[PDB]
Design a protein around this ligand. Structure first.
Ligand code: ZN
Ligand code: ZN
Length: 49
């Protein structure tokens, strides 16, 4: 079928990117593995195991 995980958007308030970690509120939820990362930051964040 497809091994592509679907990401979602989230922005609480006091949350920080789990990749570059900076002043902002950007987060993405990856299923199959369950991870959090900037709106994208794919260049920094690793590959969804
Ligand atoms: Zn980031
Ligand atoms: Zn995943």
């Amino acid at each position: 079928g497809s091994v592509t995980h679907r990401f979602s958007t989230k922005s609480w308030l006091s949350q920080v990117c789990n990749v570059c970690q900076k002043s902002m509120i950007f987060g993405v939820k990856c299923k199959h593995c369950r991870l959090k990362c900037h709106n994208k930051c794919t260049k920094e964040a690793p590959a969804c195991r």
